Structure 1
Amino acid sequence: MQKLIEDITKEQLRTDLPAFRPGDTLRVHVKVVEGNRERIQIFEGVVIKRRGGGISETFTVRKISYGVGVERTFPVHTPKIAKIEVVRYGKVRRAKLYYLRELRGKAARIKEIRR
């Protein structure tokens, strides 16, 4: 990729994010604005993908909520995320965990790493 696009966008890259990879469990603290009030909704879930480069990098987290799978895809460097905290590092064998979309319950379990 152009150094020029890299240079224009460098200022908007967040530095405060922890290293995570697909299979890690995050709590993503999302700024939310229902009404005029501002509050933090937490989205806890498995990272199922992380694609793209630089300011365009996104990640997707998946949770089962009330018996329904939910995925939220965020720009890595969105200012709408207050913070990300890694709950547990998973042991997976690939970059994209789309096979989890078809699994529920015990079949959908990811082993932890001592990282």
Structure 2
Amino acid sequence: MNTLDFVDQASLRDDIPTFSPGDTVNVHVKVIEGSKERIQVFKGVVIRRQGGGISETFTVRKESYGVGVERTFPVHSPNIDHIDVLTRGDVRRAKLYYLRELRGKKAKIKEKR
């Protein structure tokens, strides 16, 4: 419980799928380019799911054209059309910052079977 839960529950988004760090996802983020709303897919590994409630952020990492990229979205942001989980990851940590120094097969999360 918190003291502002009654304020946050309004903006609290349903349809947020249950995911966790290590889980690979596709975030369909709304992108505006000069009076033109489209959707960009940030496909990447969740390294982090900080926070609670409306303030909850999740950080998704990918390697685009030979460069690491991380997007820290709010979980209940309405700029996110949806989040499509693809693979769940077997990780022994809650925050996969060690991927920031790993490029390639070293940065391949163990899929959950």
Instruction: Please classify the TM superposition score into its range, dividing by the shorter chain length.
Output: over 0.9
Question: What residue identity is the alignment partner of 1:88?
Answer: T
Say if 2:30 is the partner of 1:27. no
1:9 aligned residue? 8
What is the CA–CA distance in structure 1 between the aligned matches of 2:56 and 2:103, rounded to whole Å? 28
User: Tell me, which stretches of 5 or more residues in structure 1 are unaligned?
Assistant: none
User: How much is the aligned-residue C-alpha RMSD, in angstroms?
Assistant: 0.8
What is the CA–CA distance in structure 1 between the aligned matches of 2:86 and 2:9, rounded to whole Å? 28
Identity of aligned residues (%): 68
Q: Deviation above 2 Å: which 4+ runs of structure 1?
A: none
User: Tell me, which stretches of 5 or more residues in structure 2 are unaligned?
Assistant: none
What is the CA–CA distance in structure 2 between the aligned matches of 1:85 and 1:74, rounded to whole Å? 14
2:35 aligned residue? 36
TM-aligned CA deviation for residue 71 of structure 1: 0.3
TM-aligned CA deviation for residue 98 of structure 1: 0.3
2:48 match: secondary structure: strand
What is the CA–CA distance in structure 2 between the aligned matches of 1:10 and 1:105, rounded to whole Å? 40
Deviations 1:9-57 (A, max 9, x none): 1010111010000000000000000010100000000000011111110
TM-aligned CA deviation for residue 104 of structure 1: 0.5
Q: How many correspondences in the alignment?
A: 113
